[PDB]
Design a protein around this ligand. Structure first.
Ligand SMILES: Nc1nc2c(ncn2[C@@H]2O[C@H](COP(=O)(O)OP(=O)(O)NP(=O)(O)O)[C@@H](O)[C@H]2O)c(=O)[nH]1
Ligand SMILES: NS(=O)(=O)c1ccc(Oc2ccccc2)cc1
Ligand SMILES: [Mg+2]
Ligand code: NA
Lengths: 167, 469, 166
């Protein structure tokens, strides 16, 4: 029946990456989560009038298992590459995540979006122009999100689904 | 009727329950949220004990209460005032008679002694299972020693004297089986000849056994202090989560060693022998319930340098293709079959730690520290219970030891494995991928031939164990 | 996975904790640290079925004797432990048996009678006397050593079987 999209979240640890999927899948209006619950990472949505099922893999917390990244990444059809806007190192990591995705998928044109995540009130160190320039150099969209207000969260995932649909 | 309580003005833990200080979940109640005073009251409640509440609380309390403040609060809980004589007692004393003191005796037996015993049980569990608070704060330990060492009165004496000794033991600080472990197995490399040890020269049974002992020891060493607060992801992770990181780094190193053994074997026939041997090791890992080891192999076979080696995969025997594919199916659909298998086997086992890490991290990020009710901020205890359910599962699998004999030289060989050498990660993983491209070039480039590199027999001895008299 | 709530009861010093820690960790505890209340979990396959044992290790010291109703209500089965070199601990067994029956309002509570410290030569409770008592209760009698592991799995897993057939 309805299309299922397998999405994979990648990016540096320790900087609030997990808030993106939690806020999406969450009871939007009750701040609560049990990740152990069967299908705490599946969500039926309507994007541009077409109903589909999102299956989101976010292995946040497992970043030190670096030799597992290839296997996790190969499961995905589209990728959210996430950095924290107050952590320049996480932004500099993006290039290698994208190169690794391209190698694992054996393609120079993998659906992906660049996501800049505001995870606290600490001072921003990556300006939006820097991230827009990076995303344009890759030919991919850029979305900024808040880890606290849910702003941008739907846009990040829906934009990625549109990249898959238009591949 | 119920016992009367001290005035809440002289003893804070007698304040009535209300939605402004405690909220229960929908036969002992389960706490959703509460003030720290109410949490400590219920932790040491006179009517019962949730045996698991003490562990949950002592594992997770530092997210809402400092260790020094916890000790102050449980000392305050311990020091319960006794009620004054009743009218009947007064009348007896006025007549020169001994009072019956029925209400006082009941309050001692049914309120003071159970609450005080449960406070001491918190102290005992704190010292025995969460001693890091005292290792990191010598003054906290002094305060605990003074408190325990000055409890008077005979009802608590046995436990006070015991806890004093336990503390002194902890400051300066053996397995039995019915059956014997199986005999250590040897193949081309013989005992003592560590210089010949390698993937194909050690016995594959014994590779899997010694890696399982190593990985079990690494799994068993991880304490909840390395997990609560998601500290293994934060800037001080090397300080706060050293045993967890050692465990993960061992797993990563072994996965990379498997990949390196495969892609540095340029001759196709020899590389098939290498891959087949690693799948045999995976079979023994499965037999031993070493799921960490199972996924070490699966991760290597699904890595970019190995997964693309179609000419190698084509020559793997069908039964071994099936073993690898069924092992990979454990990880599919967010580890659905792995989780079911872990919960079905008979331990000992070595769980894969990564799922626990993701679930602890997401529980902490996805739930608020406090709940706001009637203008008050209540500690969200349900969130802490969820974290402690995960740390409790981890601990349950840390109890059972493997009945396998250590081989000190094989153990040292795997402890010292260092496939990356002095290279950085990107340099090394690009090297592995370039080797993959060399030995099996992308179509339509032709497949080259390469000379053999191993001078000893490639035939496996198999993975069924032998037993001489 | 079925969950089973087991409770270990008996006089102070008979080896309730040593028995439990031998089952859980395969380690014999030499020290005598009197218990207030401890709890353990164990996943184990028994008669081909995986279950989860929740084991409550209780206080035998008399100073805690007024705090037992709370754990007897929730326990599903009871290991009633005495030491075979301690006749008083054997005489204390019937008091635990009668209290469990009163609290659970039942004549049919899963139980096993355990004579511990069977590694010691100097026995003062004969097996026949304990077996007679067990028969009068309708329950099995198993002699154990927390030190050597003799009988330990048999005692706990026999209790599980009795809960499973209850
Ligand atoms: N020889 C021998 N000693 C044992 C055995 N079981 C326990 N002991 C010893 O007896 C002492 C008391 O054991 P312990 O497990 O603390 O008894 P308990 O019944 O749990 N005591 P309590 O009711 O106070 O908590 C310890 O010194 C322990 O080593 C056994 O099977 N054999
Ligand atoms: N997804 S899986 O685990 O079943 C799997 C299947 C085939 C693989 O290819 C190869 C396997 C061995 C050597 C070379 C190549 C890898 C992994
Ligand atoms: Mg004990
Ligand atoms: Na920065």
């Amino acid at each position: 029946g309805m299309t299922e999209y397998k999405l994979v979240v990648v990016g540096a640890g320790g900087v609030g990456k997990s808030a993106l999927t939690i806020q999406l899948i969450q009871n939007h209006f009750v701040d609560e989560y049990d990740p152990t619950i069967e299908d705490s990472y599946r969500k039926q949505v309507v994007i541009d009038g077409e109903t589909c099922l999102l299956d989101i893999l976010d292995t946040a917390g497992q970043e030190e298992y670096s030799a597992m990244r290839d296997q996790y990444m190969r499961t995905g059809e589209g990728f959210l590459c996430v950095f924290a806007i107050n952590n320049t190192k996480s932004f500099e990591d993006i290039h290698q995540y994208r190169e690794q995705i391209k190698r694992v998928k054996d393609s120079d044109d993998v659906p992906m979006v660049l996501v800049g995540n505001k995870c606290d009130l600490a001072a921003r160190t990556v300006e939006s122009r820097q991230a827009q320039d990076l995303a344009r150099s890759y030919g991919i969209p850029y979305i900024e999100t808040s880890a606290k207000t849910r702003q941008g969260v739907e846009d990040a995932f829906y934009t990625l689904v549109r990249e898959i649909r238009q591949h | 009727g119920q016992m009367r309580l001290p005035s809440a003005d002289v003893y804070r833990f007698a304040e009535p329950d209300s939605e402004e200080n405690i909220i229960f979940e929908e036969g002992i109640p389960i706490i959703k949220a509460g003030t720290v005073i109410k949490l400590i009251e219920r932790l040491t409640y006179h009517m019962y004990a949730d045996p698991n509440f003490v562990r949950t609380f002592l594992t997770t309390y530092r997210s809402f209460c400092k260790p020094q403040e916890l000790l102050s609060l449980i000392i305050e809980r311990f020091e319960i005032p006794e009620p004054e004589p009743t009218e009947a007692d007064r009348i007896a004393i006025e007549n020169g008679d001994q009072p019956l003191s029925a209400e006082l005796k009941r309050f001692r037996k049914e309120y003071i002694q159970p609450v005080q015993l449960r406070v001491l049980n918190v102290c005992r569990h704190w010292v025995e299972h969460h001693f890091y608070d005292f290792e990191r704060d010598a003054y906290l330990l002094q305060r605990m020693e003074e408190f325990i060492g000055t409890v008077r009165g005979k009802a608590m004496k046995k436990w006070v004297e015991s806890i004093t000794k336990i503390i002194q033991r902890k400051k300066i600080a053996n397995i039995t089986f019915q059956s014997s472990p199986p005999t250590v197995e040897w193949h081309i490399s013989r005992p003592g000849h560590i210089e010949t040890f390698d993937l194909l020269t050690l016995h594959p049974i014994e590779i899997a056994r010694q890696l399982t002992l190593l990985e079990s020891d690494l799994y068993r060493a991880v304490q909840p202090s390395e997990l609560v607060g998601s500290v293994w992801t934060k800037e001080d992770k090397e300080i706060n989560s050293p045993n967890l990181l050692k465990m993960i780094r061992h797993t990563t190193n072994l996965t990379l060693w498997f990949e390196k053994c495969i892609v540095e074997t340029e001759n196709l026939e020899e590389r098939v022998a290498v891959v087949s041997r690693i799948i045999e090791i995976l079979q023994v890992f499965q037999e031993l319930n070493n799921f960490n080891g199972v996924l070490e192999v699966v991760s290597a076979m699904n890595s970019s340098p190995v997964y693309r080696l179609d000419h190698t995969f084509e020559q793997i025997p069908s039964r071994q293709k099936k073993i690898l594919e069924e092992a990979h199916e454990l990880s599919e659909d967010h580890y659905k079959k792995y989780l079911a298998k872990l919960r079905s086997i008979n331990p000992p086992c070595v769980p894969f730690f990564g799922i626990y890490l993701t679930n602890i991290l997401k529980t902490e990020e996805g739930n608020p520290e406090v709940l706001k009710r009637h203008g008050k901020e209540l500690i969200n205890f349900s969130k802490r219970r969820k974290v402690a359910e995960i740390t409790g599962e981890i601990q349950q699998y840390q109890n059972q030891p493997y009945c396998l004999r250590v081989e000190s030289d094989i153990k040292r060989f795997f402890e010292n494995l260092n496939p990356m050498g002095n290279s950085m990660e990107k340099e090394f993983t690009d090297y592995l991928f370039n080797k993959s491209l060399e030995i099996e070039p992308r179509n339509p480039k032709p497949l080259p031939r390469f000379p053999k590199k191993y001078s000893y027999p490639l035939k496996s001895p198999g993975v069924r164990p032998s037993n001489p008299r």
